[model samples]
Target: SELPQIPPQQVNNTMYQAFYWDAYPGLWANLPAMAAPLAERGITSMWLPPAAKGMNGTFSVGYDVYDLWDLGEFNQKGTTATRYGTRQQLQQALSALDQLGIQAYFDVVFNHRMGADAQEHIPGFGLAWTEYHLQGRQAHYTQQNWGYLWHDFDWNWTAFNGSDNQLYPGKWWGNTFHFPYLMGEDVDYNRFEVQQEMKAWGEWIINSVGFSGFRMDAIAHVDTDFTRDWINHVQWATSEDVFFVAEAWVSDINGYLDAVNTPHLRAFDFNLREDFVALSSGSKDMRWWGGLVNSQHRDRAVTFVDNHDTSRAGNPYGMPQVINYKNQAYAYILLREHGVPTVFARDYDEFGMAPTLDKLIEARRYFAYGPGHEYSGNTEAVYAYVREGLSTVPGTGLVMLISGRNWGGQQSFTINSHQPNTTFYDYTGNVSGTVTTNAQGYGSFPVTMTESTGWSVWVPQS
Candidate 1:
């Protein structure tokens, strides 16, 4: 019975933007209070920001991580808690989420460290540590004598890509794939001990921490096979259905697929974000996403509109500005369930889009069933799709039609919902009209695109 409390896919069935724009402090403790609202919106899990203490203490985002093992337990980094909150608060947050079938996806920044024990004093690289000293709290797993001063683990020359990384650096796979060494000391997953340590960390976070899943930070920097193996190890040891989503962050669909195609893992659809930005530019067709969602890694695509690091130029393409179609983008992604659509937290606040987002998510949860049929294709003006319901999910299907070109106007198309004589209505209310199917389930959908923007999601009227 070694399985997690939730299934793997459900962990990401609806991942909410728990924190964004680097906002933090006590976010973990804030989970339970949001359970009801989040559950009602159909968010199955909350993707928490980094939890461990950073080298910059409470002053830094958890990305510049100083203490991986000290999740608000040690008085390290000049504080017992990181930016999020104390470890106890994190535990409580998970408990509240668990009370309502909501899962916690803890962010794990592996790949490298920033606030290391002793910097190598590289002439050009600055204080980069080739070792770790948990002097703040160790005999980590075994004790906390309260008088403990320190503990050290030398990640010697043998533990990294090139201990002589100071000068004698190394490339990946005999120079085939050049790995990115971001932040602090670069971690070499090729080392067996490193993988073993990562595996152990996974088990600890799962059992001691109560996180249902993980948001593996920068898995592209690490070996793919090592990642696959590490995830396998954690899954084998747990009774929880531990799932992971890699933040590879690349726009090339095939390149992204290659980076995170692992067992029980999902990768963000960076290509979809690019299309959103392009669509906002009004220079690209709405159907460009058609190419991506139907790609090889279609089932594992974790779709997102804009994230905290939206401008992170991690690949060849320079990061584009966040698209202006925040509301319409939400309707398109949330209404039609192709990829795992992630709703940005700020859109609900900054853009005053809570109502719009709420309706789309609930519609996706109830409707948007059956094999999604893309009805409108290859159009710069609009793109539409239908989710024909099955016997078990009758009347719970959706039709999403969106366009940016038609302002203060409308568009009409005849599509088949396959549910004969069923009546449908626009859930967004912006479309302002409804439709009814003929005897053969063929309905004429006229979208009275609102003055605000042009999009509508039609679902069987209750």
Candidate 2:
């Protein structure tokens, strides 16, 4: 209920992380063909990779942020366009993407300044972060009042957290620092100018470049206070209460809980993500899937099965193989009445999981409404639940029965059909049997599992 009111596209629509780490280069130029099925599947939002300039230019997946202004325009690094696409193509794609009820979420990487035009020596932060030319964006900087916008300052040690021995060299191959410093010259959120620069950049990206919102990369790495203020600054300036989901990457319950309550905020539930990936006991106690931050921060939670960072291309971090029991996991997240579920492209396109995910997404959009009743047991091998129809919409709501293995698990849970003798059928097409409700809205239904690791949605007969 935070006000200024976020755009409806951000609220009603489910999000899709559109790009994989090693996605085909320049696919940003291919939105027209992609938007159709996405709209039909009830995916109204897309979180694309960083569209701005990166240190590695054409190949960088945008983590190494360099020129924030360069959206594939000027010649820089090794190529004119960033790894995603050119500025003209990007703009065209966003325009086409808008027509499809999808708004673009730019990945914002603002932790450190990399690919410095020139380096200078400072007494404290060592001599490296001394000065930056930013020749590629110098003209763009002038027009935007770059230095003044962030508050005039010469680049020096005070502007950074110095270096971390993990990635940077020891001129300070620098093994010493306060906050966590990753690759490149770490920006000091403690510094006022750097904070202002990011705040202005947010406005520029929203008001000028036209992104509907942001998916801030590696939020855990940055100062929690500054990151929240920066986005709030942009939101105030533009009057565009945009969508934002932090890659909080916090895997534990406490960290996840501490990450929320920022102004107009939502965070990816990394806690549940680990649970989803660990469902490799062959199957899981479905109760294991619903807990911790997923319940604590339900309204502002952005849940996902797996994303780029957890993919094969996300190498060195997560395994290349997709997680086991992913369909079962999808059925839980997409149909449950909690969190804004994110559909990953790796699973949807690369893994060919759309047919099932789309069906669940359709259910989430139309029928999975109102209250739910759980018929859980000591084991989730036969998990069951029902959504008692909604008043705003008729002929909605469904009963769900999922079995990790085709054990023909059964449960006779009662729910309000709101209609006496209302006939219900398995929308998943797994069964031809019909269930009829008795007066006072009660039904004794049975699940006859046939498919290995099967599921069924008992919705009202059409």
Candidate 3:
């Protein structure tokens, strides 16, 4: 999944992460009503959480996956519904999203499996919790029903790579490779049966759920070949060019991309998010900050400010929070000419930045178009960029400036070729006055950074 391919053309689309780590379980129930407002706010896609039943049952949060088929339908995990909601509610949410022209992306966790049904003893590994027998279903391998048995390919020690539990401190000795161990039984991708079953499950979920795309979790831990083949197999079976974004959380992202080497994959830009974290503490300069957006792989980057893992609510990774000047971060991603931006739900609803996000998202949808030009001499405290307007699309250009100072200042940038002799206004309303451009397409735009909110987005006056 790491091999780099020429990124496809960029699209002016925005995605909404529909849930946070500590989000309430009523997400599926409330998603119907939330869809229309989010669509109106210009969200092109919605990334929903994992839908499988977790080990913790009603509180599993869907990551500690127990049974993939038991999506609030069977009675096993101490409750019928997962943390999000019941299966029926999930269907309703997907239907609502589809109706409103919003694409739904399913979050898939395949690196590990947790909450086993039993533990069996192995030779060198001692007793391991690798048995999985879904007791909720009585049917065999039927197309209409969920079924599983110990012999009919449920799971055993042979089906696994290794685990920290039992006698072994880490994985078994057969596979000499190492990966970060997430808590659970690691499925052996070297086994043909395991590969075939997982491929079948991928097809089954997409065929049943009607999702437009997938967000593969923990890709760094899974086999790269399996990851690539898994995506290819699912696409071939379904006859759809399914969108895929991998959560390849690694430092040398470029090297990893080269290793995985697939053109059909996009990745979460954690490097950029780390930069935003440093910027939150006024320790990083926006002018010199680099990420996949600044690299050659920008077309395949999914830029985001904060996510469920990075939010203060449930930061499992212990990442620094982007608490200061978050609005500026939004402007950086949402109004940029590169990357596909995903707006975090906590930032929009819980943290009370909806008004700011709504405007920026709308600006991206309507005005932030054409090519981008960053001011060359941008300082540590101030940086500016302009999206030159498109000739075919009138009023489709914008000027965005961000300052770290308590009192914002103005910067001169060239907007001549696209927006010459035009009058502009602050779309963010943080700055007041009509900015008129010279016939040469140069204009001095002002910004207000009072109380550390130095975010101003300028668009031509309609």
Best by lDDT: 3
Q: Report the lDDT tens digits of candidate 1 across residue range 1-462.
A: 121122234232777877765565577667687567978667887788888888888877688776678887787768888777888888888888888878788788876666555557544444446556654335354323211222224554334553333422442421112255554556667765566666767777888678888888876766667777888878887897886787875446456446445558777777777677876665557665743456777777777788878733352345687656666677767755567788877666555677778877777766666677777443666777887765564466777777755365777878887778888888778766568999998887766544255667787776
User: lDDT of all predictions, in order shown?
Assistant: 0.68, 0.68, 0.76
Cα displacement (angstroms), candidate 1, residue 93, comes to: 0.3
* lDDT score of residue 207 within candidate 2: 80
Q: What would the TM-score be for candidate 3 when compared with the true structure?
A: 0.90
Rank order (by TM-score, best first)? 3, 1, 2
Report the error of model 1 at residue 210, Å.
0.9
In angstroms, the error of model 1 at 82 is 0.6
Candidate whose TM-score is highest: 3
List where candidate 2 sits over 4 angstroms from the true fold.
Answer: 1-11, 124-131, 135-137, 142-158, 165-179, 253-260, 291-293, 313-315, 318-322, 376-378, 406-420, 444-453
Candidate 1 versus the native: TM-score?
0.86
lDDT of 2 at 405: 46
Candidate 3 per-residue lDDT, tens place, 276-361, comes to 88778765675776889889999888999988888865566777788888888889899888888999988998999998889888
Weakest 10 consecutive residues of candidate 1 by summed lDDT: 143-152
TM-score of each: 0.86, 0.86, 0.90
Per-model tally of clashing residue pairs: 9, 5, 7
